[PDB]
Amino acid sequence: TADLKSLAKRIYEAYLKNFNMNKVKARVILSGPPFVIHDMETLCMAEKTLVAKKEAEVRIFHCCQCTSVETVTELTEFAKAIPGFANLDLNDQVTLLKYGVYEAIFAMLSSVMNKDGMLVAYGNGFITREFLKSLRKPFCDIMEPKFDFAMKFNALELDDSDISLFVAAIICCGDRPGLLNVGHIEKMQEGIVHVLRLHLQSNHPDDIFLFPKLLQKMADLRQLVTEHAQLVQIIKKTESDAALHPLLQEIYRDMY
């Protein structure tokens, strides 16, 4: 229905407008120039670009943090384009966002990642996968699971129009803890998922099973976030130099 066809465009619109990075321009950059960070020297050079006059692992740990806070803010504004979200109870908007933020972060970060590294610093830097592996434990275990997910997720060849609805569906999960009006959210969820399923059919006629694959990726993302939140706790509890942004701690607070 043209209403359905227009609903996807709505969400695709709010997506291109609230997220400073997207797959189309990330690929425009990844092709061909981002400053390559591939060893300790190039990391320190790139840092001096910002603070002219703690420990490499800990500085990286806070840079990623800065990207999460930004995306939390962007996701909230994006959520408005979903039919019914703004009509939901406030406490339920907070709960859906609290549990869907990191799932959406790691989903969208794939657009910026390839087998060799990922775009960082607003498209100005490119940090290598091998360098991230070379970091001392346990900071070297942060990103490699995100690359494994991203490599298989990107193999699905989704575009920003698909990821648009995928991220909306992520936020629209009816089985999040502490939801008051679970009934309305599931109806909200059913509407987003419906238009996602049909959009995938029309946009990817060469892969009719793309929708079941994305449902599986949704569950993979959930497990990916649970494990990531755990590793953050280990770093926070240990590594006495590793602070945790307070807005991010409130997201993890009572999550998994």
Task: Note the residue count of the chain.
Answer: 256
Q: How many beta carbons lie within 10 A of that of residue 159, not counting itself? A: 15
> What is the distance of C-alpha 235 from the center of its chain?
20
Q: Would you say 102 is a known binding-site residue? A: yes
Query: Measured at CB, which residue is nearest to ligand EWR?
Result: 68
CB 131, min distance to ligand EWR, A: 9
Q: How many beta carbons lie within 10 A of that of residue 101, not counting itself? A: 21
- Enter the DSSP assignment of 117: E
CB 98, min distance to ligand EWR, A: 13
Residues in touch with ligand EWR (CB under 6 A) = 60-61, 63-68, 105, 109, 118, 120-121, 127, 142-143, 232, 248
Our CA angle for 186, 188, 193, nearest 5°, is: 90
Q: Would you say 68 is a known binding-site residue? A: yes
CB 109, min distance to ligand EWR, A: 6
Tell me the C-alpha distance between 20 and 9, whole Å. 18
- Indicate the residue among 204 and 236 with the shorter CB distance to ligand EWR: 236
CB 211, min distance to ligand EWR, A: 27
Cis peptide bond N-terminal to 34, omega within 30: no
CB 78, min distance to ligand EWR, A: 17
Cβ 135 vs Cβ 56: under 8 Å: yes
Provide the 3-class DSSP secondary structure of residue 85.
Answer: coil
Q: Tokens for 116?
A: 């060799």
- Indicate the residue among 117 and 191 with the shorter CB distance to ligand EWR: 117
Cβ 110 vs Cβ 217: under 8 Å: no
CB 52, min distance to ligand EWR, A: 16
Q: Tokens for 92?
A: 């339920």
- Indicate the residue among 216 and 230 with the shorter CB distance to ligand EWR: 230
- Indicate the residue among 104 and 210 with the shorter CB distance to ligand EWR: 104
Q: Would you say 252 is a known binding-site residue? A: yes
- Indicate the residue among 105 and 210 with the shorter CB distance to ligand EWR: 105
Beta bridge partner(s), residue 67: none
- Indicate the residue among 12 and 252 with the shorter CB distance to ligand EWR: 252
- Enter the DSSP assignment of 136: P
Enumerate the known binding-site residues: 68, 102, 252
Q: Which residues are annotated as a binding site for indeglitazar?
A: 68, 102, 252
